[PDB]
């Protein structure tokens, strides 16, 4: 028994990253960043406020979704909890990713 790995295609679209009341609208695109990563469009300013850094890429995983840096290294991984994907910061603050 194993989990299936969603395609960039089925997860691509309009998403909202909700933080400390702030909300960033990001578009998870099918544009290729690299071999295992696609492109993400969004306001860096907004993203810097809610995450330790403004990510530029993303990729689905069987259990969640990963927002990456230009070289593909992980910025923040969001686990899938039913209808939303959530990530906790070093201080324990929750960040939510939900498809609009």
């Amino acid at each position: 028994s194993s989990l299936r790995l969603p395609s960039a295609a089925e997860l691509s679209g309009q998403w909202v990253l909700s933080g400390a009341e702030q909300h960033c609208d990001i578009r998870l695109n099918t544009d290729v960043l690299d071999g295992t990563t696609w492109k993400l469009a969004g306001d860096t300013a907004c993203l810097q406020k809610l995450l330790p850094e403004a990510p530029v890429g993303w990729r689905p995983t069987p259990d969640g979704l990963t927002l990456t840096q230009a070289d593909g290294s992980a910025v923040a991984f969001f686990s899938r909890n039913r209808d939303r994907y959530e990530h906790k910061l070093v201080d324990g603050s929750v960040r939510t990713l939900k498809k609009k």
Binding site: L5, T36, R59, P62, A74, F77, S79
Partner: protein, 468 residues
């Protein structure tokens, strides 16, 4: 200091011993191994552990309209690619434990079998599941189902395991089950909404076991979107418990990473772009972790059961318990390379590296860049069996002795003298022009004779080449 770097790396991913991580108990390599095998079911019998085993396997010619015990249909025999990759996964299990696999013709009774399925019921395509298998000795309705593994060929990675590592990992994982392994926790795909919150111990992630469903990032790893192809650290412990450790594997002088002589796709790379992810199992010889082709800053630890950050990834390389790797070669990035109690040859390569040989008689090479050579114990390099720094650059490289000071709770503890008095912390530097060798003697324990000695090829300027 260069010592701090070494210290961080030696305390990276500590586990077991009442530690709590992510709100879960932390299990040690040994506990995790036993837990993954909690079903106690092996091909040698219920609760029969540590015996070798020889299994047969085949790729039956399933007819599309048949239905398997799970009620799935739209079946098919494994394609050539799938068979190729399935044979590579089988081998990786055979590499670590005493298992012997032999392929029988499609139609012969085999212990382990592989087949694809595409529908949950006639005319209905299943685009939701991935794969499943039955543990050995699984009696259901009067018949044995043990050893069957099934894959949903509608998933591209299952159809193309050779180009999609998740598919290759799925094969190794399902074979794990067919051999007797369980998920490290009590969860199952599709059975509700299982999440990392349902784990029994914190190390139940892809960083430690490919039998896990959870992202390696949960424990701090980062495999860049790749998936290990062969059994990971806790997997090795689990399988060796069931069928014993394979003491015949790579008993010669083996090289992992670049210029590998392993003949294993997962233990080798030919470019900076081809990242590796593996847990090393080696039974003998003088081995080397060659990571020279990578340009990323790396952290290599040669201690058994430890993690290294290789090729730009995090917690992607580890060494199984009971394994001794002797040499390591950094790449062009700024690396931290830590040896073990064996005699090691550590080379930093380009970039500004930190090297720590540990115990035994080591040979260290900083290579190009401003490198730091770290020492923390007199016995690390005792007179008569000292470490050798083979390429020290006066005014560029540095020798880190700060530990002895911190340990002595005083900064002025280590002090250079022109003549020994027998006093502790006395350091004496002398140059041998005939051989171009600087001899560094230190009397840590205030003995009649110094108890620490480092032979350095080159010259050292005391005014600039030390960290205390």
């Amino acid at each position: 200091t260069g010592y701090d770097a070494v210290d961080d790396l030696l305390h990276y991913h500590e586990r077991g011993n009442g530690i709590q991580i992510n709100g879960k108990d932390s299990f040690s390599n040994e506990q995790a191994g036993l837990f993954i095998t909690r079903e106690n079911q092996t091909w040698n019998g219920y609760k029969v552990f540590g015996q070798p085993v020889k299994l047969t396997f085949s790729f039956p010619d399933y007819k599309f309209s048949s239905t398997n015990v799970a009620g799935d249909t739209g079946l098919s025999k494994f394609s050539a690619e799938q068979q190729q990759q399935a044979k590579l996964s089988l081998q990786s299990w055979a590499d670590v434990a005493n298992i012997t696999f032999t392929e029988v013709a499609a139609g012969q009774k085999a212990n382990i079998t592989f087949g694809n399925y595409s529908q949950d019921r006639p005319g209905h395509y299943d685009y939701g599941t991935q794969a499943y298998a039955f543990l050995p000795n699984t009696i259901w309705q009067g018949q044995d189902l043990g050893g069957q593994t099934w894959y949903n060929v509608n998933q591209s990675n299952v159809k193309h395991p050779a180009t999609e590592d998740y598919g290759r990992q799925t094969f190794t994982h399902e074979i794990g089950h067919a051999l007797g392994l369980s998920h490290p926790g009590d969860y199952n795909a599709g059975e509700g909404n299982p999440t990392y919150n349902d784990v029994t111990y914190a190390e139940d992630t892809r960083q430690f076991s490919l039998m896990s469903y959870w992202s390696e990032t949960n424990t701090g790893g980062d495999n860049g979107g790749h998936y290990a192809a062969a059994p990971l650290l806790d997997d090795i412990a689990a399988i060796q418990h069931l069928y014993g450790a394979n003491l015949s594997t790579r008993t010669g002088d083996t090289v992992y990473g670049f210029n590998s002589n392993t003949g294993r796709d997962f233990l080798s790379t030919t470019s900076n772009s081809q990242k590796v992810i593996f847990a090393a199992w080696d039974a003998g010889g003088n081995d080397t972790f060659d990571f020279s082709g990578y340009t990323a800053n790396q952290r290599i630890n040669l201690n058994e059961k430890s993690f290294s950050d290789v090729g730009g990834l995090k917690g992607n390389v580890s060494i199984a318990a009971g394994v001794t790797i002797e040499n390591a070669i950094g790449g062009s990035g700024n690396d931290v390379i830590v040896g073990n109690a064996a005699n090691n040859v550590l080379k930093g390569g380009a970039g500004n590296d930190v090297l720590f040989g540990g115990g035994g008689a080591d040979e260290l090479w900083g290579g190009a860049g401003k490198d730091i050579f770290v020492f923390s114990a007199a016995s690390d390099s005792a007179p008569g069996a000292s470490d050798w720094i083979r390429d020290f650059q006066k005014g560029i490289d540095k020798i880190d002795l700060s530990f002895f000071n911190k340990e002595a709770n005083s900064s002025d503890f280590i002090h250079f003298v022109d003549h020994f008095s027998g006093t502790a912390g006395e350091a004496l530097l002398s140059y041998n022009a005939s051989s171009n060798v600087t001899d560094l003697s230190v009397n840590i324990g205030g003995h009649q004779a110094p108890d620490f000695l480092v032979k350095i090829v080159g010259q050292v300027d005391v005014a600039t080449d030390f960290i205390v």
